[PDB]
Amino acid sequence: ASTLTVRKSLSDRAKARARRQARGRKKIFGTVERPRMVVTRSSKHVFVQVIDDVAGNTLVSASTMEAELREMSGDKTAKAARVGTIIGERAKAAGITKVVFDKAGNQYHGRIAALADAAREAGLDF
Amino acid sequence: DIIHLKAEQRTEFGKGAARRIRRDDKVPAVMYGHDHDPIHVTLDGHATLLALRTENPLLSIEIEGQKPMLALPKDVQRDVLKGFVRHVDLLTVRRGEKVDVNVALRITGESAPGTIAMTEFNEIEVQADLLNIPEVIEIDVTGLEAGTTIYLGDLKLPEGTSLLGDAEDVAATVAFPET
Amino acid sequence: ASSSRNGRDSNAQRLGVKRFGGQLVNAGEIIVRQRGTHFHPGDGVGRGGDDTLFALRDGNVEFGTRRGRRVVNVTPVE
Amino acid sequence: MLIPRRVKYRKQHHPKRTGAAKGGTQLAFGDYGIQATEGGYLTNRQIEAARIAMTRYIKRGGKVWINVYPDRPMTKHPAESRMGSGKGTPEWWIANIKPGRVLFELSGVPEDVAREAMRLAIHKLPMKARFISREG
RNA sequence: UUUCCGGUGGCCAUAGUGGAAGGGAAACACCCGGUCCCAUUCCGAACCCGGUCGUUAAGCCUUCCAACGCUGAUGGUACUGCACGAGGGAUCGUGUGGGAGAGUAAGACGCUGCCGGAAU
RNA sequence: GUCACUCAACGGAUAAAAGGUACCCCGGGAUAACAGGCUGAUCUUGCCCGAGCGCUCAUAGCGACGGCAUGGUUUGGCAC
RNA sequence: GUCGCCUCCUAAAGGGUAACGGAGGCGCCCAAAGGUUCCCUCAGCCUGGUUGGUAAUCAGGUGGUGAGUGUAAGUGCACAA
RNA sequence: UUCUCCCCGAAAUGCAUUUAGGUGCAGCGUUGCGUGGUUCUUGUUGGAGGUAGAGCACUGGAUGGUCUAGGGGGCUUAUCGGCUUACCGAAAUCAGCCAAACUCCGAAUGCUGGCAAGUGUAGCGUGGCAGUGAGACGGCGGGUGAUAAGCUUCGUCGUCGAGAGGGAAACAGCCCAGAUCAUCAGCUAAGGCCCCUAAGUGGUGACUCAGUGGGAAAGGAUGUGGAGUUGCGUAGACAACCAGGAGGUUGGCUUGGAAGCAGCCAUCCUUGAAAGAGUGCGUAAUAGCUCACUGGUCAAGUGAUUCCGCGCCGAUAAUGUAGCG
Ligand SMILES: [Mg+2]
Ligand SMILES: [Mg+2]
Ligand SMILES: [Mg+2]
Ligand SMILES: [Mg+2]
Ligand SMILES: [Mg+2]
Ligand SMILES: [Mg+2]
Ligand SMILES: [Mg+2]
Ligand SMILES: [Mg+2]
Ligand SMILES: [Mg+2]
Ligand SMILES: [Mg+2]
Ligand SMILES: [Mg+2]
Ligand SMILES: [Mg+2]
Ligand SMILES: [Mg+2]
Ligand SMILES: [Mg+2]
Ligand SMILES: [Mg+2]
Ligand SMILES: [Mg+2]
Ligand SMILES: [Mg+2]
Ligand SMILES: [Mg+2]
Ligand SMILES: [Mg+2]
Ligand SMILES: [Mg+2]
Ligand SMILES: [Mg+2]
Ligand SMILES: [Mg+2]
Ligand SMILES: [Mg+2]
Ligand SMILES: [Mg+2]
Ligand SMILES: [Mg+2]
Ligand SMILES: [Mg+2]
Ligand SMILES: [Mg+2]
Ligand SMILES: [Mg+2]
Ligand SMILES: [Mg+2]
Ligand SMILES: [Mg+2]
Ligand SMILES: [Mg+2]
Ligand SMILES: [Mg+2]
Ligand SMILES: [Mg+2]
Ligand SMILES: [Mg+2]
Ligand SMILES: [Mg+2]
Ligand SMILES: [Mg+2]
Ligand SMILES: [Mg+2]
Numbered sequence A: 001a002s003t004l005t006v007r008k009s010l011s012d013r014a015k016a017r018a019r020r021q022a023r024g025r026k027k028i029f030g031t032v033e034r035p036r037m038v039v040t041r042s043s044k045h046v047f048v049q050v051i052d053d054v055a056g057n058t059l060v061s062a063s064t065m066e067a068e069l070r071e072m073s074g075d076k077t078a079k080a081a082r083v084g085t086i087i088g089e090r091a092k093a094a095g096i097t098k099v100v101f102d103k104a105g106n107q108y109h110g111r112i113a114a115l116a117d118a119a120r121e122a123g124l125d126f
Numbered sequence B: 001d002i003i004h005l006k007a008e009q010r011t012e013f014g015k016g017a018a019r020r021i022r023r024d025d026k027v028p029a030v031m032y033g034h035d036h037d038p039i040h041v042t043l044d045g046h047a048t049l050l051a052l053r054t055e056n057p058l059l060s061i062e063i064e065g066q067k068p069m070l071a072l073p074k075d076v077q078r079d080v081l082k083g084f085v086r087h088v089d090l091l092t093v094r095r096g097e098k099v100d101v102n103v104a105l106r107i108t109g110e111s112a113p114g115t116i117a118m119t120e121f122n123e124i125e126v127q128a129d130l131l132n133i134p135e136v137i138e139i140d141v142t143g144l145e146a147g148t149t150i151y152l153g154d155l156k157l158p159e160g161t162s163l164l165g166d167a168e169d170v171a172a173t174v175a176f177p178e179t
Numbered sequence C: 001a002s003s004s005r006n007g008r009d010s011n012a013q014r015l016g017v018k019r020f021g022g023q024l025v026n027a028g029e030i031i032v033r034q035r036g037t038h039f040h041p042g043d044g045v046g047r048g049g050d051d052t053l054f055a056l057r058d059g060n061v062e063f064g065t066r067r068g069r070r071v072v073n074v075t076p077v078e
Numbered sequence D: 001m002l003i004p005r006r007v008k009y010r011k012q013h014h015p016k017r018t019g020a021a022k023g024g025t026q027l028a029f030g031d032y033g034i035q036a037t038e039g040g041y042l043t044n045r046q047i048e049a050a051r052i053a054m055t056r057y058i059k060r061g062g063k064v065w066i067n068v069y070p071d072r073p074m075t076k077h078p079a080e081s082r083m084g085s086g087k088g089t090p091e092w093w094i095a096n097i098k099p100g101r102v103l104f105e106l107s108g109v110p111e112d113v114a115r116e117a118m119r120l121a122i123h124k125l126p127m128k129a130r131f132i133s134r135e136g
Numbered sequence E: 001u002u003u004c005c006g007g008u009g010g011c012c013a014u015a016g017u018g019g020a021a022g023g024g025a026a027a028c029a030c031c032c033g034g035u036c037c038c039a040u041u042c043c044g045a046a047c048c049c050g051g052u053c054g055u056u057a058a059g060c061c062u063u064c065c066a067a068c069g070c071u072g073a074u075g076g077u078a079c080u081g082c083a084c085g086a087g088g089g090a091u092c093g094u095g096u097g098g099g100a101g102a103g104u105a106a107g108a109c110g111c112u113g114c115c116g117g118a119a120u
Numbered sequence F: 001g002u003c004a005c006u007c008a009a010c011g012g013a014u015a016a017a018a019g020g021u022a023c024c025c026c027g028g029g030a031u032a033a034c035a036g037g038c039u040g041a042u043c044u045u046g047c048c049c050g051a052g053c054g055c056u057c058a059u060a061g062c063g064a065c066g067g068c069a070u071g072g073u074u075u076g077g078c079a080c
Numbered sequence G: 001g002u003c004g005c006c007u008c009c010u011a012a013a014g015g016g017u018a019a020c021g022g023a024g025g026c027g028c029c030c031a032a033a034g035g036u037u038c039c040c041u042c043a044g045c046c047u048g049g050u051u052g053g054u055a056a057u058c059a060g061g062u063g064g065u066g067a068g069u070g071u072a073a074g075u076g077c078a079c080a081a
Numbered sequence H: 001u002u003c004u005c006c007c008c009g010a011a012a013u014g015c016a017u018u019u020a021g022g023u024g025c026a027g028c029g030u031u032g033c034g035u036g037g038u039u040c041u042u043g044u045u046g047g048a049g050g051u052a053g054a055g056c057a058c059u060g061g062a063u064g065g066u067c068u069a070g071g072g073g074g075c076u077u078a079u080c081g082g083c084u085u086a087c088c089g090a091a092a093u094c095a096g097c098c099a100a101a102c103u104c105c106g107a108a109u110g111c112u113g114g115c116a117a118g119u120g121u122a123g124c125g126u127g128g129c130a131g132u133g134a135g136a137c138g139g140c141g142g143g144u145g146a147u148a149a150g151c152u153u154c155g156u157c158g159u160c161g162a163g164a165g166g167g168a169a170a171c172a173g174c175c176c177a178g179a180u181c182a183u184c185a186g187c188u189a190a191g192g193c194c195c196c197u198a199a200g201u202g203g204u205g206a207c208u209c210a211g212u213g214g215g216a217a218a219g220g221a222u223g224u225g226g227a228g229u230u231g232c233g234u235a236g237a238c239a240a241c242c243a244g245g246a247g248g249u250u251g252g253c254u255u256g257g258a259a260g261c262a263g264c265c266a267u268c269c270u271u272g273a274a275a276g277a278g279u280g281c282g283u284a285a286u287a288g289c290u291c292a293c294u295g296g297u298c299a300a301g302u303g304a305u306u307c308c309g310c311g312c313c314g315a316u317a318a319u320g321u322a323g324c325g
């Protein structure tokens, strides 16, 4: 469900995030060679999916929602780094190697940056 | 009242076919409704003109193979200089039912010689019943002068003829002469 | 007598689509000369300094819509 | 004399005078009216003459509508001059009349004297025109 | 497998706008802080960080409303390629092909892919 | 590699250039003056409408505003 | 009066198309008004507010392009160019 | 600028020019060599568009209505405040409109690809030799000009140029048709068939009576045929012909006179089977003559009104009929 225009009556923070996400997506686009890693950073969780934007499907994905990580005691940044390591491992399993990072309207910092560096250490070329 | 018109199937379409029909002194018509596919027919020119002399008449179209069916002329394309009917849109009506139509406004009132009544509209969209179509809607401005104006929400409309158009705009105006 | 304050005009620039839909093109072949992006660069199409849309790869030219934009794509040849 | 307050371009191509009336073929304000049966150009002087005739005949009662407006400027080549040296200066203002166009309308007047006033007006126009009504 | 919901695309209003009613299990969100990375051309509003108590009031979600907007035939008309014809002239008509725009009936309170969630 | 031209008459005759000819001299009707021809804006001669003026009385006689043409003799347009 | 260049119309929905046809511009400017990266959304309107007025700055509401674009015009650009 | 025949066969455009009647390059001709369906036509299939038309979303132009900020005029009288706002009025809004340089829209054609079929021998490359670079008119779409020109300048097709033959009275540019030669054969095209003049004073049905045909406008007209719509009509219509065609009332501002007739109006009432403060003619001013309306002998159709076909007037220069040859 995408509609170009930012939905009116949306909250101010949601509109700001949607606009920033759109302007990043303006140049970010995932192909089979370099799929697009999208990280949605909700207030309590981060959900990462590697998407082939040509076909419109997700190849691999991960999130803090996984039961193996729900009870993994740690700070938000540490949990995001664990998610990044997991998603890098799954990308290696699927044979992705190189991706393009889509911050999805958020600043590349904090939890998002920790997850990105964790994936880089796991072995993703980006 | 019901006006009966004999019609037969029309199958040739286009400007050439329409010209040939009008030279044959018939008139093309398309009859459509809310239940069936549009039917393309041709009518007798003289009979169509006689029927369409009045405004919003209830017509019954008879086709030899088919059965008579009830319609109203919703859009009549007439010639501009000559008065001939060039094309008819017939909208089918389900006998016992309700319809939206236009009824003509006229002035039948007299005021002081200084002021003259004026109509702000030719027709008003009035939701009436089939068997009682108001031929004319009449408003009387007698004994009223100066700059009084009449909107669409105060009319002596006949029974069963509800107003569908907007009631927040003027319909009749009386004002001093063309000074 | 009189005179005209007009009579100046610029040389013909010869804009417009140079390769229409389905036409086979080579890489780098110019597809449309234009001022501004009446057509945006689509897949396999690059946009130059003067908004010329050219082919980034061999294939067939198609005109389409990408999101809300009129775009020109070059489908790679089968 | 109807002259527009301003126009975007004072020197324009001659208006197309082909085809029937694009719009305004039906009475919209008055009860009776003049309908042009032939196309042509209608200058502001002719419009004013016809309006004066109608108003003067109908005296004080009734009201007149001028449906058309002479907003198209017509230039004139400078007199006694050879061809060339640019377009001329606007000299006439016209309205583009096509067959079926309603030019003038009248209301608040009995039909017979309305007809006579329309006849007076029509005898001032440069194209054929007829008296029309809302079928009475 | 299904239902519901959160993300991420595609079509880009038949999806919007406005009104009404109802919903939160996970989730989303507002919310609570600012000690820490970081931040405000002032402001922890925002960005960022730390929590998930509180709250479905709003976002979001579900149902309903053609009301504004949007979509929209058939037939006819305008125009028109070709071939002719008629007027003193503006210009007009016909044959043979194509054929709108406006308007009319009507449609429509979105459609569809992938991933995840909680239950089945 | 770069510089020096309002070479602007901007594909840029010379680095360097204004006038007079009724004293004039040596292809074009491709092009003007005269006449003819076309056209008819202008001119001209009529005509339609009838506001008004004519004690009264539109039309004895006049004719405002507008409209339609004739003639080709006026000034022009065209350059056959 | 004009002569080179640019934009629009004429130009008859590719391109091209003449007249002493109709409109305007150019002979620059900018060390940022270039490159890149991230962020932002205007004009107008309504309401409230010291000086303060139609209009300075501020607040809330509305408002999708009608603002803006170094410079003409067109094509673009609110995903912002 | 001098002999012949055979084959093909232009251009009068673009660009540049101390250039505009010159010239270079390209376009178009021919020819050698090479390449062979690449050209072209039609169908089919797919593209980009913003013209015609249309529309009013935008930008301008615009009519009327509603409504109104705000300006003008007054007074009570003003510092207000009120009555006014019977005046003006941006904006907004409703309805009808306008646009080469407006567009929410949007053709037909044209252009350009794929495919298929058809096709003269078309297309292309590369050499030799050119000529041309003053065009004309007609159809269609436009600019300049005045709705002008056998005008001027473009787009496009045709002919002429460089094209004889047939038609157009004659008549480069219009229509038919592209002449290899011969023929004292036939069929046709455009156009024609009374005679000039080849073929019908053809057949059948309508219309015209103007010599319209065989030039023209606004406008005007009981011309004439046909097709409607509609009022009245043997309760007896329209004409024609005998009686009532008038009281109150010389209705009022006029004007020595407006009594029914100078101009402008409420556009009434009555003795009654019948009538208008009143329509023509008359008239200093009233008189009166005479009509719609009422009886009757007669009485079968009249009175409007619209559209269509063909005609009429408007119509009008100078050597001689003289605008069918
Ligand atoms: Mg650039
Ligand atoms: Mg550049
Ligand atoms: Mg309209
Ligand atoms: Mg529609
Ligand atoms: Mg349509
Ligand atoms: Mg030069
Ligand atoms: Mg030199
Ligand atoms: Mg001397
Ligand atoms: Mg000499
Ligand atoms: Mg000459
Ligand atoms: Mg010559
Ligand atoms: Mg001469
Ligand atoms: Mg001579
Ligand atoms: Mg002369
Ligand atoms: Mg000349
Ligand atoms: Mg010439
Ligand atoms: Mg073009
Ligand atoms: Mg074209
Ligand atoms: Mg040229
Ligand atoms: Mg030959
Ligand atoms: Mg147009
Ligand atoms: Mg040459
Ligand atoms: Mg030359
Ligand atoms: Mg030349
Ligand atoms: Mg020439
Ligand atoms: Mg030429
Ligand atoms: Mg020509
Ligand atoms: Mg012209
Ligand atoms: Mg010529
Ligand atoms: Mg020659
Ligand atoms: Mg020839
Ligand atoms: Mg010949
Ligand atoms: Mg001949
Ligand atoms: Mg001959
Ligand atoms: Mg024969
Ligand atoms: Mg023949
Ligand atoms: Mg002879």
Ligand SMILES: [Mg+2]
Pocket (backbone or CB within 6 Å): none
């Ligand atoms: Mg005979």
Ligand SMILES: [Mg+2]
Pocket (backbone or CB within 6 Å): none
């Ligand atoms: Mg005979």
Ligand SMILES: [Mg+2]
Pocket (backbone or CB within 6 Å): none
């Ligand atoms: Mg005669």
Ligand SMILES: [Mg+2]
Pocket (backbone or CB within 6 Å): H214
């Ligand atoms: Mg004659």
Ligand SMILES: [Mg+2]
Pocket (backbone or CB within 6 Å): none
């Ligand atoms: Mg005549």
Ligand SMILES: [Mg+2]
Pocket (backbone or CB within 6 Å): H169, H325
């Ligand atoms: Mg003859």
